[PDB]
Design a binder for this molecule. Structure first.
Ligand SMILES: CC[C@H]1CN(Cc2ccc(-c3ccccc3-c3nnn[nH]3)cc2)c2ncccc2O1
Ligand SMILES: CC[C@H]1CN(Cc2ccc(-c3ccccc3-c3nnn[nH]3)cc2)c2ncccc2O1
Ligand SMILES: Nc1ncnc2c1ncn2[C@@H]1O[C@H](COP(=O)(O)OP(=O)(O)O)[C@@H](O)[C@H]1O
Length: 324
């Protein structure tokens, strides 16, 4: 379709998280609702462009092709919606956006399947990694863009849309530690104790959404490695130690385990999608954890770095740029 061609090369327009906190308002909601309406088809055209650029033999996979078709169908609906003139139009478009986000929450699982099935025809190792990095960061971009606007209409304490005004890293880490320990206890009959130190009283404006993927994943990796390396003494395992470092530039979360480390022979593969030694949105398994967490961290001005002490344990450093 030529309508997709019109915006496929159009640069994305992003608001700065700082500017989104600055705007803290029906007259301003109308301005941002029109913005969403104009921006969302551009993000979808950018995804269609990705599918159009895939090698023909990969793009021809029925599962990959079906996802390509889903995006084309969604683009038609977003562009078919008439322009927003008042708050009544602004609210009917929110409903359409909510519906389409919900109907396609599961697309990453389908893409991962299609790309697995096409593995024999993938001669370039970097091609799948680059496609999936772009897919996961753009899908997070779409999610944050749409969910933030929907949340601006709601009156949640300590939030301006999806931006928490006083996020505590210790609190969000504890929420996920409890969840991970509960599941780890179900699987092994025990879970390592998690100690949290450093800047335990830090609070600052932050978007928790990416941490809700990264933290349970990095905690699972640390707890699982700890249990897998201490199966001979499963009720006496070393603690996972998490350090919080907060400065004016970034937030650092170091997760240190005594789970034996990442072997030298696996080191150059742990950041690949589908690489695993274990027996809605991106998957929390199938070797998607580390590369998704890194793509997320890099997309938000930070990084995800690993330090392996083979025979002892691993230190994982999650760095995320502050909003200020
Ligand atoms: C709004 C219309 C678009 C939306 N997208 C993209 C989209 C959808 C859901 C989530 C999402 C919503 C809730 C929770 C999680 C996640 C998610 N994050 N990463 N992947 N899915 C994100 C990104 C989409 N995808 C395929 C075909 C058509 C599509 O129509
Ligand atoms: C000044 C340039 C920006 C570049 N980025 C990227 C960036 C932009 C918007 C959102 C976002 C936040 C909340 C809601 C929506 C969206 C958004 N808009 N479009 N796509 N995502 C997230 C991440 C960035 N990252 C971290 C800290 C500061 C940053 O300064
Ligand atoms: N803290 C860790 N200690 C030891 N091995 C780890 C650790 N984190 C990751 N790994 C290794 O890296 C692999 C890939 O990790 P990940 O991408 O999160 O996917 P998955 O959890 O599905 O296996 C794991 O299967 C494991 O071999």
């Amino acid at each position: 379709q030529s309508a997709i061609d019109v915006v496929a090369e159009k640069p994305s327009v992003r608001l700065t998280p700082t500017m989104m906190l600055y705007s803290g308002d029906g007259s301003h909601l109308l301005k941002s609702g029109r913005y969403l309406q104009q921006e969302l088809p551009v993000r979808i055209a950018h995804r269609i462009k990705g599918f159009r650029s895939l090698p023909f033999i990969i793009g021809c996979n029925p599962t990959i092709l079906h996802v390509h078709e889903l995006y084309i169908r969604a683009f038609q609906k977003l562009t078919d919606f008439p322009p927003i003139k008042d708050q009544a139009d602004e609210a009917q478009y929110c409903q359409l956006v909510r519906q389409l986000l919900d109907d396609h929450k599961d697309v990453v699982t389908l893409l991962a399947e299609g790309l697995r099935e096409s593995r024999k025809h993938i001669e370039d190792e970097k091609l799948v990694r680059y496609f999936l990095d772009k897919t996961l960061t753009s899908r997070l971009g779409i999610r944050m863009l749409a969910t933030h606007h929907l949340a601006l209409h709601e009156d949640k304490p300590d939030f301006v849309g999806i931006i928490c005004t006083r996020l505590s890293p210790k609190k969000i880490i504890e929420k996920w530690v409890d969840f991970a320990r509960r599941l780890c206890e179900h699987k092994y009959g025990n879970a390592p104790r998690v100690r949290i130190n450093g800047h335990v009283a830090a609070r600052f404006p932050f978007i928790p959404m990416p941490l809700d993927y990264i933290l349970p994943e990095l905690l699972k990796n640390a707890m699982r490695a700890t249990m897998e390396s201490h199966l001979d003494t499963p009720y006496n395992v070393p603690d996972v130690v998490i350090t919080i470092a907060n400065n004016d530039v970034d937030l650092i979360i170091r997760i240190s385990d005594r789970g034996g480390g990442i072997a030298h022979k696996d080191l150059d593969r742990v950041m690949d999608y589908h690489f695993t030694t274990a027996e809605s949105g991106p998957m929390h398994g199938f070797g998607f954890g580390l590369p998704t967490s890194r793509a997320y961290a890099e997309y938000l001005g930070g990084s995800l770095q690993l330090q392996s002490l083979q025979g002892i344990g691993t230190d994982v450093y999650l760095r995320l740029r502050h909003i200020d």
